[PDB]
Amino acid sequence: AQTFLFQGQPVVNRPLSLKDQQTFARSVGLKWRKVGRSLQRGCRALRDPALDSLAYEYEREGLYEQAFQLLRRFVQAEGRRATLQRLVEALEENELTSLAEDLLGLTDPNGGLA
Numbered sequence: 797a798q799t800f801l802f803q804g805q806p807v808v809n810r811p812l813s814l815k816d817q818q819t820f821a822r823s824v825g826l827k828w829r830k831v832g833r834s835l836q837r838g839c840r841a842l843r844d845p846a847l848d849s850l851a852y853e854y855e856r857e858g859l860y861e862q863a864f865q866l867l868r869r870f871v872q873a874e875g876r877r878a879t880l881q882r883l884v885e886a887l888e889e890n891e892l893t894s895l896a897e898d899l900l901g902l903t904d905p906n907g908g909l910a
Contacts, residue, residue: 797910802884803893808900808909809879812867815908816880816899821863823899827890828863835886841873 799808812820824831832847846869854862870878880900887896901908 805897807897809881811878812880817864817867820867820899821860823895824863825859828859830890831886832866834889838885839882842869
């Protein structure tokens with residue numbers, strides 16, 4: 797429907813859902829730190845030392861809850877305006893091209909969202 801060209805790969809523009817938050821923390825795993833730190837420059841709304849308190853507050857569940865709620869931090873700011881574009885810009889730093897499209901569930905022989 798509404799996609800933009802990113803890293804030479806097609807990607808739909810919209811607010812990430814619970815799937816993206818869960819799949820993210822379950823996909824980045826260790827990169828959860830990098831994506832969060834890369835998003836600091838990309839999004840001034842998350843530039844703050846959020847990752848510091850995020851890791852300590854989400855240190856109970858581990859990288860799972862750490863990155864799970866990390867994706868919601870951006871949606872909490874605006875949610876309506878907050879688009880995958882910002883998240884993708886953070887992955888573009890660590891060279892997570894496949895992770896950016898796969899995040900939305902583009903690893904299927906069809907797709908996911910619509």
